Every structure is written in structure tokens, then in C-alpha cells.
Design a protein around this motif. Structure first.
Motif, PDB file in Angstrom:
ATOM      1  N   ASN A 104      -6.816  13.790 -17.624  1.00 39.47           N
ATOM      2  CA  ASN A 104      -6.349  15.166 -17.459  1.00 39.47           C
ATOM      3  C   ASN A 104      -6.442  15.855 -16.103  1.00 39.47           C
ATOM      4  O   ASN A 104      -6.090  17.023 -15.988  1.00 39.47           O
ATOM      5  CB  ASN A 104      -6.903  16.051 -18.562  1.00 39.47           C
ATOM      6  CG  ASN A 104      -6.308  15.715 -19.894  1.00 39.47           C
ATOM      7  OD1 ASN A 104      -5.088  15.618 -20.032  1.00 39.47           O
ATOM      8  ND2 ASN A 104      -7.160  15.485 -20.881  1.00 39.47           N
ATOM      9  N   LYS A 105      -6.857  15.120 -15.073  1.00 43.41           N
ATOM     10  CA  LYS A 105      -6.941  15.670 -13.721  1.00 43.41           C
ATOM     11  C   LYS A 105      -5.884  14.992 -12.846  1.00 43.41           C
ATOM     12  O   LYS A 105      -5.641  13.805 -12.986  1.00 43.41           O
ATOM     13  CB  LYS A 105      -8.354  15.476 -13.143  1.00 43.41           C
ATOM     14  CG  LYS A 105      -9.303  16.710 -13.279  1.00 43.41           C
ATOM     15  CD  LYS A 105     -10.511  16.490 -14.229  1.00 43.41           C
ATOM     16  CE  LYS A 105     -11.447  15.378 -13.717  1.00 43.41           C
ATOM     17  NZ  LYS A 105     -12.533  14.927 -14.677  1.00 43.41           N
ATOM     18  N   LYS A 106      -5.174  15.760 -12.031  1.00 48.51           N
ATOM     19  CA  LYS A 106      -4.175  15.170 -11.155  1.00 48.51           C
ATOM     20  C   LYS A 106      -4.816  14.945  -9.805  1.00 48.51           C
ATOM     21  O   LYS A 106      -5.579  15.777  -9.320  1.00 48.51           O
ATOM     22  CB  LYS A 106      -2.972  16.084 -10.973  1.00 48.51           C
ATOM     23  CG  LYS A 106      -2.207  16.378 -12.232  1.00 48.51           C
ATOM     24  CD  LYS A 106      -0.942  17.152 -11.902  1.00 48.51           C
ATOM     25  CE  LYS A 106      -0.861  18.423 -12.718  1.00 48.51           C
ATOM     26  NZ  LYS A 106       0.441  19.106 -12.431  1.00 48.51           N
ATOM     27  N   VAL A 107      -4.504  13.814  -9.202  1.00 47.01           N
ATOM     28  CA  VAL A 107      -5.034  13.458  -7.898  1.00 47.01           C
ATOM     29  C   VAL A 107      -3.934  12.788  -7.095  1.00 47.01           C
ATOM     30  O   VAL A 107      -2.877  12.496  -7.630  1.00 47.01           O
ATOM     31  CB  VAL A 107      -6.234  12.495  -8.041  1.00 47.01           C
ATOM     32  CG1 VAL A 107      -7.453  13.250  -8.549  1.00 47.01           C
ATOM     33  CG2 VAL A 107      -5.906  11.393  -8.992  1.00 47.01           C
ATOM     34  N   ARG A 108      -4.138  12.642  -5.791  1.00 50.37           N
ATOM     35  CA  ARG A 108      -3.163  11.977  -4.939  1.00 50.37           C
ATOM     36  C   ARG A 108      -3.942  10.940  -4.212  1.00 50.37           C
ATOM     37  O   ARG A 108      -4.863  11.268  -3.462  1.00 50.37           O
ATOM     38  CB  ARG A 108      -2.541  12.930  -3.923  1.00 50.37           C
ATOM     39  CG  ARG A 108      -1.945  14.155  -4.542  1.00 50.37           C
ATOM     40  CD  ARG A 108      -0.849  14.690  -3.679  1.00 50.37           C
ATOM     41  NE  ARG A 108       0.420  14.056  -4.004  1.00 50.37           N
ATOM     42  CZ  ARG A 108       1.516  14.724  -4.359  1.00 50.37           C
ATOM     43  NH1 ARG A 108       1.501  16.057  -4.442  1.00 50.37           N
ATOM     44  NH2 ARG A 108       2.636  14.063  -4.636  1.00 50.37           N
ATOM     45  N   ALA A 109      -3.593   9.687  -4.423  1.00 48.02           N
ATOM     46  CA  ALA A 109      -4.338   8.658  -3.752  1.00 48.02           C
ATOM     47  C   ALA A 109      -3.503   7.461  -3.382  1.00 48.02           C
ATOM     48  O   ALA A 109      -2.288   7.414  -3.624  1.00 48.02           O
ATOM     49  CB  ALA A 109      -5.519   8.240  -4.598  1.00 48.02           C
ATOM     50  N   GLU A 116       0.800  -1.206   0.000  1.00 46.63           N
ATOM     51  CA  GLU A 116       0.000   0.000   0.000  1.00 46.63           C
ATOM     52  C   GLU A 116       0.843   1.270   0.000  1.00 46.63           C
ATOM     53  O   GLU A 116       1.686   1.462   0.873  1.00 46.63           O
ATOM     54  CB  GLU A 116      -0.924  -0.003   1.214  1.00 46.63           C
ATOM     55  CG  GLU A 116      -1.851   1.185   1.236  1.00 46.63           C
ATOM     56  CD  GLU A 116      -2.494   1.411   2.562  1.00 46.63           C
ATOM     57  OE1 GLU A 116      -1.749   1.617   3.545  1.00 46.63           O
ATOM     58  OE2 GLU A 116      -3.742   1.413   2.629  1.00 46.63           O
ATOM     59  N   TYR A 117       0.637   2.126  -0.990  1.00 48.63           N
ATOM     60  CA  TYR A 117       1.370   3.385  -1.067  1.00 48.63           C
ATOM     61  C   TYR A 117       0.394   4.526  -0.891  1.00 48.63           C
ATOM     62  O   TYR A 117      -0.601   4.624  -1.606  1.00 48.63           O
ATOM     63  CB  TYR A 117       2.109   3.528  -2.395  1.00 48.63           C
ATOM     64  CG  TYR A 117       3.295   2.614  -2.520  1.00 48.63           C
ATOM     65  CD1 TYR A 117       4.546   3.000  -2.075  1.00 48.63           C
ATOM     66  CD2 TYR A 117       3.155   1.336  -3.033  1.00 48.63           C
ATOM     67  CE1 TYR A 117       5.624   2.121  -2.122  1.00 48.63           C
ATOM     68  CE2 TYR A 117       4.225   0.468  -3.081  1.00 48.63           C
ATOM     69  CZ  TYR A 117       5.462   0.851  -2.627  1.00 48.63           C
ATOM     70  OH  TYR A 117       6.505  -0.048  -2.638  1.00 48.63           O
ATOM     71  N   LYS A 118       0.678   5.368   0.088  1.00 48.13           N
ATOM     72  CA  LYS A 118      -0.177   6.499   0.394  1.00 48.13           C
ATOM     73  C   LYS A 118       0.265   7.713  -0.392  1.00 48.13           C
ATOM     74  O   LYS A 118       1.421   7.809  -0.793  1.00 48.13           O
ATOM     75  CB  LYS A 118      -0.082   6.847   1.884  1.00 48.13           C
ATOM     76  CG  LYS A 118      -0.673   5.825   2.845  1.00 48.13           C
ATOM     77  CD  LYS A 118      -2.168   5.976   2.927  1.00 48.13           C
ATOM     78  CE  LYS A 118      -2.695   5.506   4.268  1.00 48.13           C
ATOM     79  NZ  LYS A 118      -4.179   5.479   4.232  1.00 48.13           N
ATOM     80  N   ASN A 119      -0.679   8.629  -0.599  1.00 52.25           N
ATOM     81  CA  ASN A 119      -0.469   9.919  -1.272  1.00 52.25           C
ATOM     82  C   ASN A 119       0.422   9.914  -2.518  1.00 52.25           C
ATOM     83  O   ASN A 119       1.383  10.677  -2.582  1.00 52.25           O
ATOM     84  CB  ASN A 119       0.064  10.943  -0.255  1.00 52.25           C
ATOM     85  CG  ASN A 119      -0.715  10.922   1.065  1.00 52.25           C
ATOM     86  OD1 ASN A 119      -1.911  11.217   1.096  1.00 52.25           O
ATOM     87  ND2 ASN A 119      -0.045  10.536   2.149  1.00 52.25           N
ATOM     88  N   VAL A 120       0.056   9.116  -3.519  1.00 48.70           N
ATOM     89  CA  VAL A 120       0.805   8.995  -4.755  1.00 48.70           C
ATOM     90  C   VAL A 120       0.165   9.895  -5.811  1.00 48.70           C
ATOM     91  O   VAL A 120      -1.060   9.993  -5.878  1.00 48.70           O
ATOM     92  CB  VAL A 120       0.754   7.544  -5.241  1.00 48.70           C
ATOM     93  CG1 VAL A 120       1.466   7.373  -6.567  1.00 48.70           C
ATOM     94  CG2 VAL A 120       1.346   6.637  -4.186  1.00 48.70           C
ATOM     95  N   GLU A 121       0.999  10.584  -6.593  1.00 46.89           N
ATOM     96  CA  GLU A 121       0.535  11.477  -7.652  1.00 46.89           C
ATOM     97  C   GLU A 121       0.071  10.665  -8.825  1.00 46.89           C
ATOM     98  O   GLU A 121       0.826   9.889  -9.404  1.00 46.89           O
ATOM     99  CB  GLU A 121       1.633  12.442  -8.147  1.00 46.89           C
ATOM    100  CG  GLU A 121       1.168  13.277  -9.373  1.00 46.89           C
ATOM    101  CD  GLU A 121       2.202  14.256  -9.907  1.00 46.89           C
ATOM    102  OE1 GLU A 121       3.237  13.816 -10.469  1.00 46.89           O
ATOM    103  OE2 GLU A 121       1.964  15.488  -9.819  1.00 46.89           O
ATOM    104  N   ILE A 122      -1.163  10.900  -9.210  1.00 42.16           N
ATOM    105  CA  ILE A 122      -1.766  10.193 -10.322  1.00 42.16           C
ATOM    106  C   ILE A 122      -2.373  11.228 -11.260  1.00 42.16           C
ATOM    107  O   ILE A 122      -2.928  12.234 -10.815  1.00 42.16           O
ATOM    108  CB  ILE A 122      -2.912   9.280  -9.828  1.00 42.16           C
ATOM    109  CG1 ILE A 122      -2.363   8.175  -8.926  1.00 42.16           C
ATOM    110  CG2 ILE A 122      -3.699   8.730 -11.013  1.00 42.16           C
ATOM    111  CD1 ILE A 122      -3.415   7.430  -8.171  1.00 42.16           C
ATOM    112  N   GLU A 123      -2.212  11.015 -12.553  1.00 43.11           N
ATOM    113  CA  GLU A 123      -2.805  11.892 -13.527  1.00 43.11           C
ATOM    114  C   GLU A 123      -3.532  10.963 -14.460  1.00 43.11           C
ATOM    115  O   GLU A 123      -2.940  10.028 -14.990  1.00 43.11           O
ATOM    116  CB  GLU A 123      -1.750  12.671 -14.302  1.00 43.11           C
ATOM    117  CG  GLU A 123      -2.350  13.734 -15.213  1.00 43.11           C
ATOM    118  CD  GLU A 123      -1.333  14.291 -16.174  1.00 43.11           C
ATOM    119  OE1 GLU A 123      -0.627  15.243 -15.796  1.00 43.11           O
ATOM    120  OE2 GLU A 123      -1.220  13.743 -17.290  1.00 43.11           O
TER     121      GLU A 123
END
Ligand SMILES: CC[C@@H](c1cccc(NC(=O)CNC(=O)OC(C)(C)C)c1)c1c(O)c2ccccc2oc1=O
Lengths: 99, 99
Positions: free
Chosen positions: A68-73, A58-65
Motif C-alpha cells: 500500500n505504499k508507493k515508491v520510486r526505485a 537497470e531502470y531508474k525512478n520506476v513507480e512501484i506500489e
């Protein structure tokens, strides 16, 4: 992208810069992807699928795009048959399911 | 009906007048449910999910009543911990992913 479900909801996303093909899954609470090296800030976790349970990291707070929207999950890396982007990411994208 | 994904999209589906609770799944191609009797015109199939392979009986052209609509789709029955309504039913309902 409006998703007419006639074609499997598969998309290409960037998980911390590395591109991966993922399936938009409204049935999964979590997201799990195989093959990316995200690092050493992990925590072994278990995810129960429809056929059984698999061990994952499990990896917390990962940058995902994606779309076209960037999120951290939270993303889990494991030996999964398909890469899945679950509800935890769909809700961060503001994605809904319409009839 | 719109379904924000904050909570698992679980609805009550009437398959041949038998009420079951099904999880609306965009990721899945097929729909699988347990605990219902659909007759004797089946075909044994194997579905692969996260965690393992599932043995099922496939029934084509079954009357389903869910989300206030009635459809005719293929339903697989098997010993699954969670009843899933996949893309074959979601396309038939005219559902789409949004944003
Ligand atoms: C329907 C389950 C779901 C899934 C995916 C990823 C993670 C998790 N796990 C969760 O986030 C929710 N876990 C949960 O409800 O636990 C159980 C024990 C009751 C199943 C679940 C799931 C699929 O969309 C699916 C879609 C296409 C092909 C195989 C699949 O194979 C699955 O398995």
C-alpha cells in the motif's frame, strides 16, 4: 503487513501498473524482476547472485506500489529464477527486521 | 534487535563454536555457509540461486549462536561467496519483517 517469516515473504506489487509477485529479500542490495516491459530508458548492468552473475537492464525512478505504499526505485529486469525486491525498496518502504 | 535495512544485515554467527559472518536473508529458505567443518553426517543437496546452482552438504540439528540466542537448525556448507542465514534460522530466532 507484519511479516512472521513462517510463510515465505512473497507479495503482489504493481511495477508501473503491471502486477508482479515478488519476494521481499533482506539479503539483496538490488531488486530484479523478470517479464515486465518497462521501456527504452535502460542501461545494461550486471548483478551477482549467490550462484553467478546475470546481465540485467537497470531502470531508474520506476513507480512501484507494494504493501500500500508507493515508491520510486531502481528495478532491474533480467533472466532471474525468482522476482526479488531488495533493500533499495525495503528501505523506501520503511521496512525493518525485528527480533 | 531491530535492523533498519540501510546497510546489509550482516552479523557474526557461531556455528559449533566457529565464528562466521552471515547475511540475514529473508528471501532464502535455507542457510548456507562456507569455510566451516561440521562433521560427517551430511546429505549432498543442490541449491538454486540467482546466477546458478550450488552443491552443498546438509547438516541437520547444528548448534548456532547468533544475535545472542542459541538455535538448532540445518546448515548447508558449500563454496559460496557469501554466507547466508535464511528463513529456517530467522523463524527459529523469532524474527519478523516490519511495516
Ligand atoms: C544472497 C544474494 C541474493 C541476491 C538476490 C538478488 C540480487 C542480489 N545481488 C545483490 O543485490 C547483492 N550482491 C552481492 O552481494 O554480490 C555477491 C557476488 C557477493 C553475491 C543478490 C540471493 C538471494 O537472496 C536468494 C534468495 C532465494 C533464492 C536464491 C537467492 O539467490 C541469491 O543470490
Amino acid at each position: 503487513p507484519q511479516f512472521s517469516l513462517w510463510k515465505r515473504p512473497v507479495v503482489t506489487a504493481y511495477i508501473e501498473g503491471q502486477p508482479v509477485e515478488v519476494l521481499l529479500d533482506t539479503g539483496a542490495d538490488d531488486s530484479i524482476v523478470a517479464g515486465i516491459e518497462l521501456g527504452n530508458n535502460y542501461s545494461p548492468k550486471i548483478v551477482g547472485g549467490i550462484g553467478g552473475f546475470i546481465n540485467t537492464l537497470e531502470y531508474k525512478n520506476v513507480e512501484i506500489e507494494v504493501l500500500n505504499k508507493k515508491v520510486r526505485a531502481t528495478i532491474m529486469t533480467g533472466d532471474t529464477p525468482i522476482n526479488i525486491f531488495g533493500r533499495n525498496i525495503l528501505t523506501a518502504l520503511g521496512m525493518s527486521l525485528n527480533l
